[PDB]
Structures are given as C-alpha cells and as structure tokens.
C-alpha cells in the first residue's frame with residue numbers, strides 16, 4: 001500500500017491524481033459574482049472527491065473519516081489550487097482559464113476584498129519561492145490529511161489507528177518534499193528552511209479558509225443547507 | 236544582531252524571555268467562567284508585550300509592524316502556552332496553578348467545549364511527541380513572527396525589507412529547531428519529520444484561534460471595543 005512507496009513513486013501517484021481543470025460559465029454585482037464562484041466551487045468539489053480517493057492512504061481510512069477530512073479541507077484545497085494557478089498572474093486570480101479576476105473585482109462582493117488580498121499575497125510568496133508542481137501537489141495532500149486529524153473522536157482504539165495511519169502517510173510526504181529539494185540541489189539547511197517556509201504558508205491558507213467559511217456562513221439564509229454540506233451528507 | 240546569533244545563543248535568548256507564570260485572580264456559571272479567563276488573558280497579553288520585545292528580531296521592525304504581529308498572534312500564543320502547560324494533565328487544561336479546568340467544565344459556557352476539546356487534543360499530541368521546552372519556546376516565537384507576515388498592508392520598499400527581515404529570523408529559528416533535534420540525536424529523517432510535525436500543528440493552533448475569536452465576537456455585544464484592541468491601539 002501507501003507506506004512502502006518511494007519518494008518518486010509518491011510524486012507520480014500525486015501528479016496522476018490531479019483532476020482536470022474546470023472552466024467558468026462566463027465572466028458584475030454581488031449575486032452574479034457569487035453565483036459564478038459558487039458554481040465553480042461546487043464542480044471543483046465534485047472532482048475533489050475522486051481526487052482524494054487517488055491520494056495514497058486516503059482510501060484506507062473509514063468512510064466517515066474520509067468524509068471528515070474533506071469537510072475540514074475542501075476550501076483550503078480550493079484555495080491552494082487557486083493560488084497555484086494564479087502564481088504567474090501578478091495582482092490577479094485565475095479561477096479558470098476564462099475567469100481571471102482583478103484585485104479590484106473583489107470589491108464586487110462586500111467582504112471578499114480582504115480574502116482576495118490574502119490569496120494574492122499567498123500566490124506572490126509562492127512565486128518568490130518558485131514553488132514547483134511536485135511540491136504543490138505534495139502540499140495539497142498534506143492539507144487533505146492534516147486539516148481534520150485533530151478533530152476526530154479519539155475515544156476508541158480504532159480512531160487511534162486511523163490517526164496513526166494518517167500521521168505515517170504525512171511523514172511519507174514530508175520525506176517526499178525533502179527528496180524533491182535534495183534532488184533540486186539545495187543544501188541540507190536550505191532543505192530544512194524551505195520545508196518550514198512552505199508548511200508555515202499552510203497556516204495562512206488555513207486562516208483564509210476559516211475567513212472564507214465565516215463569510216460564506218454569514219451571507220447565507222440560515223434556513224439553508226449549502227451544497228458542500230449535502231454532498232458530504234450523501235457520502 | 237539577531238541574524239548572527241547561534242542556535243545555542245538563540246535558544247538562550249528565548250528561554251530568558253519567557254514571562255512569569257500567572258495566577259488566576261479568583262476562585263460554576265457562564266459569566267463567572269468568562270470573567271476568570273478574560274482577566275487572565277488580559278494580564279497575559281500585557282506580559283506578552285514585553286516578552287515579544289525580547290524575541291530576537293522583533294525590535295528591529297517598525298512599531299506599526301510590531302503591533303500588527305501581536306494583533307494577529309496573541310490568541311495563538313496564549314493557546315500554545317495553555318496547551319504546553321496542560322501536557323502533563325491529561326483531560327484537563329491548566330490555565331494557571333490555581334485554575335485547572337476539566338474537559339467537562341467547558342460546557343459551563345456555550346460553544347466552549349468544542350475549543351476545549353481541540354486544546355486537549357493539541358496538548359495530548361504534544362505529549363506523544365514529547366515536546367521539549369526549547370522546542371516550545373521556538374514554536375511560540377514562530378507564531379509571533381509568522382501569523383501576521385502575509386497580511387501587511389503596504390507594498391512599499393520598506394514593507395518588503397521588513398518581511399524579508401522576518402523571514403530571515405524565521406529561517407534562523409528553523410535552524411535552531413533542527414539543531415536541537417540533532418543534539419538530541421535524531422536521524423536526518425527523524426529531524427525533518429519532527430519539524431514538519433510541529434509546524435503542521437501550528438496550523439491547528441491558528442484554527443483554534445480563529446474559532447476562539449468567533450466565539451468571542453459572537454458572545455459580546457458590538458457596542459464594545461475589547462481590552463486587547465484597546466491595548467494594542469495604545470502600544471501603537
């Protein structure tokens with residue numbers, strides 16, 4: 001299974017799991033903008049499910065746990081992927097090949113400019129660090145597995161083994177990240193520094209997800225179960 | 236000067252800067268619980284200010300930048316401390332020597348138990364990894380310098396060499412963390428595996444903080460600017 005994979009074997013697995021890139025429904029008040037984004041998120045979300053299944057180790061976990069991971073990670077994963085796509089588009093966000101939005105077009109939705117700025121800062125940092133695809137894909141898997149691991153129900157011998165498994169795979173991806181960096185020619189010190197630099201960014205992506213989530217939660221009718229909830233429901 | 240400190244000099248400066256340990260002012264109910272915690276936290280924030288000035292690097296930043304860092308980090312920093320002190324107290328959170336609360340006492344205030352459970356879990360994880368104080372004091376400093384760095388207003392030339400500076404100091408603290416692990420005799424693999432492990436926990440701490448601010452914001456009427464806000468505005 002996933003624990004005996006080599007670093008090359010893991011990068012491959014991860015690159016192959018990558019889901020196709022989605023298009024938007026076509027390029028401006030609050031409702032029209034939130035509709036595009038909401039539509040794109042939901043389709044990305046449906047793709048995210050079969051991606052997660054292709055991630056080494058994810059499928060060894062019980063369903064309710066798989067679902068908990070996605071519940072906790074889905075907006076982060078959407079965001080890192082956006083930030084990655086927007087890397088070579090300074091001051092802009094590439095939601096889709098046909099939806100490239102301005103810093104300013106965030107102002108279309110009271111609340112969203114704060115969030116656009118954070119995404120722009122994140123992708124700017126990735127550009128400075130010259131983040132690579134092999135690393136991007138690794139980060140994305142770390143988010144999937146780490147964002148929900150501290151919030152299970154650890155009262156049980158089975159939730160212990162679940163946590164233990166996830167942490168073992170997380171170690172394997174760390175091993176993989178270092179492996180990529182050693183191959184790229186960085187020194188030990190540079191390796192350790194880049195590892196840290198990248199994992200600290202994951203803290204900011206968490207922050208952004210929390211904020212996006214809080215904004216989502218305050219915009220919606222409270223009598224409404226949003227589509228992310230339902231999908232994880234029917235799972 | 237911070238950029239030329241060695242790993243041993245770094246650990247030292249940090250152990251040296253640790254603020255005293257605070258006692259609860261008093262010794263259930265919903266408002267009585269929040270009273271304890273709020274005062275404890277406010278008193279801890281005050282001590283946090285002088286602590287932060289002693290973190291190598293911090294004082295080289297402009298004032299406005301110092302205040303920003305503290306604004307983004309103060310709840311994470313309290314929380315990691317609580318988690319750290321509660322390590323050898325399973326199922327409990329040691330807010331102070333005279334205030335040891337129980338997982339169950341979290342339901343004393345609505346929504347809190349969610350947060351207590353996350354805290355207990357974090358401290359519980361630290362206990363398996365056997366976190367050391369040298370490590371702790373590094374993580375605490377990483378939260379201070381990192382939590383507000385991706386969220387600086389300006390695009391000026393100075394703003395750039397200001398976060399350049401922060402990232403240099405962060406790199407030095409990564410160096411110190413590893414140095415520590417290597418002295419404890421871990422393998423290279425074990426070393427980088429542990430660094431990742433600790434920094435991934437910092438993601439969870441950020442999350443607990445974000446949750447903490449939401450519960451806070453929702454319990455208090457909007458007519459009120461809270462004491463942490465007042466204090467930071469003034470430090471500026």
Ligand SMILES: CC/C(=C(\c1ccccc1)c1ccc(/C=C/C(=O)O)cc1)c1ccccc1
Pocket residue numbers: 037038040041042078079082095112115212213215216226227228229
């Ligand atoms: C930052 C963009 C964004 C997303 C989004 C992120 C990446 C890719 C596409 C969209 C977003 C907005 C609404 C939703 C709604 C989901 C749902 O209603 O089920 C999901 C994500 C968002 C999230 C919250 C508030 C404003 C915008």
Ligand SMILES: CC/C(=C(\c1ccccc1)c1ccc(/C=C/C(=O)O)cc1)c1ccccc1
Pocket residue numbers: 272273275276277313314317330347350447448450451461462463464
């Ligand atoms: C989890 C405990 C806690 C803190 C706290 C944490 C560790 C040590 C001391 C306090 C907390 C509670 C209230 C405040 C209030 C601050 C203020 O009013 O300015 C700050 C922190 C808290 C935070 C949010 C909601 C409920 C409790």
